Design a protein around this ligand. Sequence first.
Ligand SMILES: COc1cc(/C=C/C(=O)O)cc(OC)c1O
Length: 283
Amino acid sequence: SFKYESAVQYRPAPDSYLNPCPQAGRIVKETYTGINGTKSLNVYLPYGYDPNKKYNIFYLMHGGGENENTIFSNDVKLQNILDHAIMNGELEPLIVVTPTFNGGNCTAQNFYQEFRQNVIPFVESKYSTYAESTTPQGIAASRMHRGFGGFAMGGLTTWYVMVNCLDYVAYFMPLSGDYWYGNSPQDKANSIAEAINRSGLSKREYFVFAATGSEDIAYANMNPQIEAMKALPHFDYTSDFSKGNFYFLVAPGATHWWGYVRHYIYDALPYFFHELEHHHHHH
Ligand SMILES: COc1cc(/C=C/C(=O)O)cc(OC)c1O
């Protein structure tokens, strides 16, 4: 059903998508020990999850003051949107993981380290992704089917994941947060460009779908960064990821609130994981 648009516009999920779907994915609370101690996360498994199939995986970080339970809590209800989108065929089934940057020495900035060493091997050894194994080689070999996103301070987390984890992750969804490395937007853009250079990847091998609200305070810092990134050769601006790799969706009137940001995920997540995919699909 899904077809890429070149300038996709903001559209909230129908109100009905905010209520429970009968085809409900299972949400599993997990606990693991890593470099920041013993911590928890939730794993959303799609309805019909079959461990003998391979699923895309999207890791999604909360904002400041929140935790690994927030996104599937009653304050957000993202699972209802996922369930309905997957049942209706708008979104291909995938695993969605909500970890936390709380605990131990962890911060929104440094979470990528724990992500690489602890979170990916824990989750992807248990559940069926494109990783045939969870050695560094096995994670890197499956990077086209792995994404990371997050809201606010979790948007900051996303940018640090991008800069430090291009080897492991191809799709990025920073929501209402900018990258804090640099004294100007050009410094931020240049850091990202240098990470890309170091990775050796082509422009067909990483994708950034950023979003915020036109009344969201984070726009002030995101917008200059996006414009600086658009000037790099590293990014081809368009939401058609069969043709380019960079988009910034700005929702008219929306403020810095999960009530809006959940809809950005609804709009953007369907755009992920079709480039070099293993099914024969026409988008
Ligand atoms: C990472 O980028 C951001 C994070 C926050 C966080 C706010 C909070 O935790 O209260 C606010 C921003 O713009 C105003 C922003 O650009």
